[PDB]
Amino acid sequence: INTQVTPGEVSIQLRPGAEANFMLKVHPLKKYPVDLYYLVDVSASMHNNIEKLNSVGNDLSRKMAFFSRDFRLGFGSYVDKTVSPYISIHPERIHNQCSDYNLDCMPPHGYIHVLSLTENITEFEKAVHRQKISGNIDTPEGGFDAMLQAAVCESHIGWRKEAKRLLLVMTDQTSHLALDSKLAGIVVPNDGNCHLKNNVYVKSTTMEHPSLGQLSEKLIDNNINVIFAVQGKQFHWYKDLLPLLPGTIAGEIESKAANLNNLVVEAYQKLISEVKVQVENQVQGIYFNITAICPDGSRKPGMEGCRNVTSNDEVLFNVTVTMKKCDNYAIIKPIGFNETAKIHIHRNC
Amino acid sequence: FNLDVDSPAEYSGPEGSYFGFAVDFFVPSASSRMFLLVGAPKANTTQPGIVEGGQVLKCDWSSTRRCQPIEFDATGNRDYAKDDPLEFKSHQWFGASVRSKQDKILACAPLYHWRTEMKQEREPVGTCFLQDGTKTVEYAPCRSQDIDADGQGFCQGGFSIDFTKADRVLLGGPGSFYWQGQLISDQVAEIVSKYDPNVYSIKYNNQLATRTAQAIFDDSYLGYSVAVGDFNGDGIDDFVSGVPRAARTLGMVYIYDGKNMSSLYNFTGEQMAAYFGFSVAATDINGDDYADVFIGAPLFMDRGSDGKLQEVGQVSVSLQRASGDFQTTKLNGFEVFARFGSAIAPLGDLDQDGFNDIAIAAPYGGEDKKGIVYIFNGRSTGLNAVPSQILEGQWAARSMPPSFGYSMKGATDIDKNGYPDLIVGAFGVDRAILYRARPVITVNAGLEVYPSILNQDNKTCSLPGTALKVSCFNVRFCLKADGKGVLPRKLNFQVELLLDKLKQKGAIRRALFLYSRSPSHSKNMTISRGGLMQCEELIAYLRDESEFRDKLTPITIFMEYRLDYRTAADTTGLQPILNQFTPANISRQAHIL
Numbered sequence A: 001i002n003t004q005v006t007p008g009e010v011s012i013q014l015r016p017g018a019e020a021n022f023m024l025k026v027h028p029l030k031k032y033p034v035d036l037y038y039l040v041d042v043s044a045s046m047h048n049n050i051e052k053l054n055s056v057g058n059d060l061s062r063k064m065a066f067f068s069r070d071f072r073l074g075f076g077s078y079v080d081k082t083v084s085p086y087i088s089i090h091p092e093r094i095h096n097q098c099s100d101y102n103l104d105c106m107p108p109h110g111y112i113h114v115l116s117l118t119e120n121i122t123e124f125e126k127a128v129h130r131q132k133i134s135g136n137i138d139t140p141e142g143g144f145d146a147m148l149q150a151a152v153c154e155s156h157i158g159w160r161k162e163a164k165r166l167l168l169v170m171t172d173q174t175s176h177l178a179l180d181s182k183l184a185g186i187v188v189p190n191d192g193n194c195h196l197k198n199n200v201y202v203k204s205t206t207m208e209h210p211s212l213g214q215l216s217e218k219l220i221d222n223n224i225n226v227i228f229a230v231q232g233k234q235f236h237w238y239k240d241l242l243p244l245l246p247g248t249i250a251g252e253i254e255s256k257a258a259n260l261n262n263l264v265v266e267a268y269q270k271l272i273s274e275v276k277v278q279v280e281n282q283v284q285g286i287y288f289n290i291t292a293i294c295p296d297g298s299r300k301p302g303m304e305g306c307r308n309v310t311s312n313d314e315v316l317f318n319v320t321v322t323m324k325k326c327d328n329y330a331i332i333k334p335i336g337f338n339e340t341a342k343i344h345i346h347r348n349c
Numbered sequence B: 001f002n003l004d005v006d007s008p009a010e011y012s013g014p015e016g017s018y019f020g021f022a023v024d025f026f027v028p029s030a031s032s033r034m035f036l037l038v039g040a041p042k043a044n045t046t047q048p049g050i051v052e053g054g055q056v057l058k059c060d061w062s063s064t065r066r067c068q069p070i071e072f073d074a075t076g077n078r079d080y081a082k083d084d085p086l087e088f089k090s091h092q093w094f095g096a097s098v099r100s101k102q103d104k105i106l107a108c109a110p111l112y113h114w115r116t117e118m119k120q121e122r123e124p125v126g127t128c129f130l131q132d133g134t135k136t137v138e139y140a141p142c143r144s145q146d147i148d149a150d151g152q153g154f155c156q157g158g159f160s161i162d163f164t165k166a167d168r169v170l171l172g173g174p175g176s177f178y179w180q181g182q183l184i185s186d187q188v189a190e191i192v193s194k195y196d197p198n199v200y201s202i203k204y205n206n207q208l209a210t211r212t213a214q215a216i217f218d219d220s221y222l223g224y225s226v227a228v229g230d231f232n233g234d235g236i237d238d239f240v241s242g243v244p245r246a247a248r249t250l251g252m253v254y255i256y257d258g259k260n261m262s263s264l265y266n267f268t269g270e271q272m273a274a275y276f277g278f279s280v281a282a283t284d285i286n287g288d289d290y291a292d293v294f295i296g297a298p299l300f301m302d303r304g305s306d307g308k309l310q311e312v313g314q315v316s317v318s319l320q321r322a323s324g325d326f327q328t329t330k331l332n333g334f335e336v337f338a339r340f341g342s343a344i345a346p347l348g349d350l351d352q353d354g355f356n357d358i359a360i361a362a363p364y365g366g367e368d369k370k371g372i373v374y375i376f377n378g379r380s381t382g383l384n385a386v387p388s389q390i391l392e393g394q395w396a397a398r399s400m401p402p403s404f405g406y407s408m409k410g411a412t413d414i415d416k417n418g419y420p421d422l423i424v425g426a427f428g429v430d431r432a433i434l435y436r437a438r439p440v441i442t443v444n445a446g447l448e449v450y451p452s453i454l455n456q457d458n459k460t461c462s463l464p465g466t467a468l469k470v471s472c473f474n475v476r477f478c479l480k481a482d483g484k485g486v487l488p489r490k491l492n493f494q495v496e497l498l499l500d501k502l503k504q505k506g507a508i509r510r511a512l513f514l515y516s517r518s519p520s521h522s523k524n525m526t527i528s529r530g531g532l533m534q535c536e537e538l539i540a541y542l543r544d545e546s547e548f549r550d551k552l553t554p555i556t557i558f559m560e561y562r563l564d565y566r567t568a569a570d571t572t573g574l575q576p577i578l579n580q581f582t583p584a585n586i587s588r589q590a591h592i593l
C-alpha cells in the first residue's frame, strides 16, 4: 500500500537480551502536490512588507509548475495576545493602537484565519490585497501560538494528506516564549488543542504560549514543513533554533524583498532533497538503534539521516531493535513525509 | 526524608481565587504565636466599586484553620478630578507576592493600572502595602513623575520581592525601560516615615536602584525573580535577580552588591529559550558558611539517548568559594513537560545534620500532572543529587491544572519540635498545604563486647548445662539511641534476638536456647537517650539430637530495631522518624582465631 516508505509494517518477536534488525527503505517520489500556507505577521513593524505580497501570486505558481503536480495557497495573520502589557488598554487605543499617529490600523488579534487553501490564485491575490496592519507595544510578537494554531486546526485551514504540507511564517522579529505570559496574569499552560471558532483564535487571551518542545511535537505530528522567512537581524535568532526544531528551514529576506519567490522555491528544493527519521517509542526496555545508509555510503547516526537525496535514488535505514527488559509498538517516520512505518513489535517475557 | 505526608495540615480559600499563589510564615516574636500567610490574587474583596482586588489571608495553625484576610487596604479608587479616577484597583492581582520578616508583612500588586497625572492613561506600575505592626503603609516606587513604556510606566513593580537581613526591601520590576527590567532596594526605616496619603511620587533618601541601559537589552525581564545572600564577604546581603531572556533568550542571572548596587558576578545559560533565571534561591547548602546560588530553567530541552530532545528542565547549583569562584553543577528533571526547576526554596536543616537543605518543585509533573516536589539534602561536598523524598499533590484538576508546587516556603518550625517545616500552594484548586518535619533518631546498633572473639583453642568459660567442650555462646544484643529535638525519653525500641537470622528457619538449628524452651527469642529493651547500650544477654548451647540437617551451621543472628512509634509520638501526633541512612541490622561473625 505504501509507496514512499517501505516497508510500511513489520511484526517482530524478541526475547530479553537479544537484538533483531531489518531494512527500511525510503524512496522519495518524483513530483509532490504542494500546499503552501502564508502565516503572515501583520504587526506594525511588518507594514512595509505586506504590500510585497501582491507579487507572490502568479510568479511563484509559475516558478513551482515543474516541482509540483498542482499548487495551493492560503493566508492568515497574527499580531499578539490582546491583553496588557502587550497592547494598550486605553479605550481609544485598545481597538486601534496606531491612533496616536492617525493610522487606519486594524484591531489587534491573536490570530485570524483568512483564506483556506485554494488553487485559485486570483482568490489569493484578492484576499491579500484587502489586508490591513495592526499594532501593539512589545518588541517581540506572538508568532509561535499562531503557528501551533495553524498546525493543529486541520479542516479549517484545509490541509491535504496527499500533499507536501508547507507553512511559511513571515516575520521580522523574535517571538514570544511560553512563560512570558506571566506578566499578563496568564499562568495556564497551553493544552495543544486548537480553538478556532469563527476563524478567530478565541483562547489567545486565557492560556499561555506554547514552548519549543510542544510546538515541535505538534508540528511533526501533523507533517508540517515550516519555512521561516525572517527579514531583519532576527534571522540569526530564528536560525540558531533550527537544531531544537527538527525539519524546519530559515531563509533571509533582504531589504528589497524581491527575493521572496526565490526564497520559497530554494527552501522547497532543499527541503525535498533531504531524508531523516525519528522514532516515537513508548515501550519499556526496548531501545532502537538506527544508522542511515546514504547513497554515498556514509554511516550517519540516522537521527539527521542522509541529505542531498533526489529521485531515482533510494535511501535505506539500517535499524537494530534491542530487548533489554520486560514489562505496544513504535512507529518510525521520516520527518516531513506523509507515510509512516508501523513496527508492530511483539514482546514475550 | 522526614517530612510527614501522613498528616498534612490542609487549607482552602474561595473557589477560583488563586488561593495559594504565594505563601509564607508569620512569626511575630512579640505575640509568640505562629501564623501562615497566603495570597489570593483573584479573590473578591469588600472594596466598593472594585471587582477581584486580591486578598492576603492570614491562616492560623494552632488547631484553628480560620483564614482572616489582612485588611491591608479597604478603600476604592482615589480620584484626580470629578469622574476622573486616579487608579484602577480592579483585577490588580494583589497578594501575588507575600514576604514576612519577624514583624512586617509586604504584599504587592503587579497589575495595578493607574491614570498617570499628566494624561489619561492606564499604566501597570504596581504597588505594595507594607504593614508594620499597627501602622500600614503603601510602597510604589515605580509610579513616578517620569513614566511611560520608555520609562518605568510598565514597571509592574512587585512582581518579585524579598527582605534583606538589614531591614531593606528588594523590589523587582520586570517591565521598565521597555522590559529591560529593574531592581529597587529601600529600607523599611524610611518607607514608614515617608508616607503622605495625599502624595503619589515619594522620594526616598536612601534608595538604591538600577538604571537604564542600551536598547539591545529590551525584553530582558530583569527582576523576574529576586533573592538575597552575602556574596562578597562584607556581611550585607547582596541582591540576586534572574533575567530569563538576556543574550538572545539564553537567560542570565545578575548579582549586585548590596551596599551600592554595583555589579559583582554574572551567570549565563547554555540553551536558547530555556528560561535560565526563572527562579533564584541563595542558600548555604554545603555548610561551609558561604552562600550558594541556585538557578532554575524550567523549559530546558535535553537530548535523549536516541537523539530526540526532551523538555525536562534543569537546576544549576553553584557553590561559592572563598576566592570569588563558583563550582557549578547541573541537575536535570525527571518527567518531560513537567517544568522541573519552577520553584526552589531553602528548607533550613530539615534533618539537623549540619548542612542546610533545599527542595525543588515540578508543578506539572507526577501522575495525572497533579504535581511533585523533590527534597534534596546537603553534604560536605555540596548538594546530594538524588532526592531523598518525593512529595506529591493529592488534588485533581477542576478546570485548570492544580499546579501543586508553584509556590512553597520553609525554614521555620511551627510545631516548635526543633525542625523546620514546609508549606506548599496548589493554587489551581485554591488550596495550600502544610507539612511537618518529624524528629530524627540515630540508632547505633552494637555488636562489640568483652570478650570480643574466641580463637576456639581455649574455653574462657564453659557454659553449664552443656555436654560439649565448647564455651558459652553469648548472643548479647543492644540498641543505643540519641536525638536532637522534642523526643520522649523512653524509646520503646522493641527488638528481637531470632536464632540464626543468617540461616533458614522452620528447622531446629544445632544451637538452641533451651532455657527459652525454643531457639526463637526476642527482646524489648527500653533504651534511654544518652545512655549506654542496654544489653540483653542470651545463652545457648549445642545439644546432641537423634537426627539433624548437620552437626553445626555458622549463621549470625540479627537484632531488630523496629519501633511502633505509638508511644514515641508527642502530643501533636508526630511520630519520630528512624534515620534510613544507618543500617537496619547489625551483628558480629563467628570465627576461629
Ligand SMILES: *[C@@H]1O[C@H](CO)[C@@H](O[C@@H]2O[C@H](CO)[C@@H](O[C@@H]3O[C@H](CO[C@H]4O[C@H](CO)[C@@H](O)[C@H](O)[C@@H]4O)[C@@H](O)[C@H](O[C@H]4O[C@H](CO)[C@@H](O)[C@H](O)[C@@H]4O[C@H]4O[C@H](CO)[C@@H](O)[C@H](O)[C@@H]4O)[C@@H]3O)[C@H](O)[C@H]2NC(C)=O)[C@H](O)[C@H]1NC(C)=O
Pocket (backbone or CB within 6 Å): B212, B213, B214, B217, B254, B263, B264, B265, B266
Ligand atoms: C554582567 O552583565 C551585565 C549585562 O551584560 C553587564 O552590564 C553591562 O555593562 C556594560 C559596561 O558597563 C554596559 O555597557 C555600557 O558601558 C559603557 C562604559 O563606558 C566605557 O566603556 C565602553 C566600552 O567600549 C567605552 O566604549 C566607553 O567609551 C567607556 O570607555 C557606558 O558608558 C554605557 O552607558 C551608555 O548608556 C547610557 C544610557 O543610555 C548613556 O547615557 C551613556 O552615555 C552610554 O551611551 C553610549 O552608548 C549609546 C548607545 O546608543 C550611545 O548613543 C552614546 O553616545 C554612548 O556611546 C553602558 O553602560 C551595559 O549597558 C550593561 N548592561 C546592563 C544590562 O546593565 C555587567 O557589566 C556584567 N558584570 C560582570 C561582573 O560581568
Ligand SMILES: *[C@@H]1O[C@H](CO)[C@@H](O[C@@H]2O[C@H](CO)[C@@H](O)[C@H](O)[C@H]2NC(C)=O)[C@H](O)[C@H]1NC(C)=O
Pocket (backbone or CB within 6 Å): A120, A121, A122, A123, A124, A126
Ligand atoms: C477565482 O477567484 C476570482 C476572484 O478572486 C473569481 O473571479 C470572480 O468571478 C466572479 C464571477 O463568478 C465575478 O463576479 C468577479 O468579479 C470575479 N473577480 C475578479 C477579481 O475577477 C474567479 O471566478 C475564480 N475562479 C473560478 C474558476 O471560479
Ligand SMILES: *[C@@H]1O[C@H](CO)[C@@H](O[C@@H]2O[C@H](CO)[C@@H](O)[C@H](O)[C@H]2NC(C)=O)[C@H](O)[C@H]1NC(C)=O
Pocket (backbone or CB within 6 Å): A003, A029, A032, A033, A161, A162, A163, A338, A339
Ligand atoms: C501520501 O502521498 C501520496 C502521494 O502524494 C499519496 O498517494 C496518492 O493516494 C491517492 C489516494 O489516497 C491516490 O489517488 C493517488 O493516485 C496517490 N498518488 C501517488 C503518486 O501514489 C498517499 O495516499 C499519501 N498517503 C497518505 C497517508 O495520505
Ligand SMILES: *[C@@H]1O[C@H](CO)[C@@H](O[C@@H]2O[C@H](CO)[C@@H](O)[C@H](O)[C@H]2NC(C)=O)[C@H](O)[C@H]1NC(C)=O
Pocket (backbone or CB within 6 Å): A019, A020, A021, A293, A318, A319, A320
Ligand atoms: C545493517 O546492520 C546489521 C546489524 O543490525 C549489520 O549486520 C552486521 O554486519 C557485520 C558485518 O559483517 C557483522 O560482523 C555483524 O555480525 C552483523 N550483525 C550485527 C548484529 O552486527 C549489517 O551489516 C548492516 N548493513 C549495512 C549495509 O550496513
Ligand SMILES: *[C@@H]1O[C@H](CO)[C@@H](O[C@@H]2O[C@H](CO)[C@@H](O)[C@H](O)[C@H]2NC(C)=O)[C@H](O)[C@H]1NC(C)=O
Pocket (backbone or CB within 6 Å): B015, B016, B017, B042, B043, B044, B051, B052
Ligand atoms: C467576584 O465577584 C464578581 C461579581 O461581583 C464575579 O464576576 C462574575 O464574572 C463572570 C465572568 O467574568 C460573570 O459571568 C458573572 O456574571 C460575574 N458575577 C456577577 C455577580 O455579575 C467574579 O467571578 C468573582 N470572582 C471570583 C474569583 O469568584
Ligand SMILES: *[C@@H]1O[C@H](CO)[C@@H](O)[C@H](O)[C@H]1NC(C)=O
Pocket (backbone or CB within 6 Å): A287, A288, A289, A290, A291, A322
Ligand atoms: C548502536 O550501534 C552503534 C554502532 O552501530 C553502537 O556503537 C552503539 O552502542 C549502539 N547503541 C545501542 C543502544 O544499541
Ligand SMILES: *[C@@H]1O[C@H](CO)[C@@H](O)[C@H](O)[C@H]1NC(C)=O
Pocket (backbone or CB within 6 Å): A308
Ligand atoms: C549532491 O548530489 C549531486 C548530484 O548527485 C552532486 O553533484 C553533489 O556533489 C552532491 N553534493 C555533495 C556535497 O556531495
Ligand SMILES: *[C@@H]1O[C@H](CO)[C@@H](O)[C@H](O)[C@H]1NC(C)=O
Pocket (backbone or CB within 6 Å): B257, B259, B260, B262
Ligand atoms: C561598591 O562597594 C564595594 C564595596 O567594597 C566597592 O568595592 C565598589 O567599588 C563600590 N562601587 C561603587 C560604584 O562605588
Ligand SMILES: [Ca+2]
Pocket (backbone or CB within 6 Å): A079, A080, A086, A136, A137, A138, A139, A140, A141, A142
Ligand atoms: Ca508583540
Ligand SMILES: [Ca+2]
Pocket (backbone or CB within 6 Å): B230, B231, B232, B233, B234, B235, B236, B237, B238, B257, B258, B259
Ligand atoms: Ca555583600
Ligand SMILES: [Ca+2]
Pocket (backbone or CB within 6 Å): B284, B285, B286, B287, B288, B289, B290, B291, B292, B319, B320
Ligand atoms: Ca557554600
Ligand SMILES: [Ca+2]
Pocket (backbone or CB within 6 Å): B349, B350, B351, B352, B353, B354, B355, B356, B357, B377, B378
Ligand atoms: Ca540536612
Ligand SMILES: [Ca+2]
Pocket (backbone or CB within 6 Å): B413, B414, B415, B416, B417, B418, B419, B420, B421, B436, B437, B438
Ligand atoms: Ca516541625
Ligand SMILES: [Mg+2]
Pocket (backbone or CB within 6 Å): A043, A044, A045, A046, A139, A140, A141, A173
Ligand atoms: Mg513587529
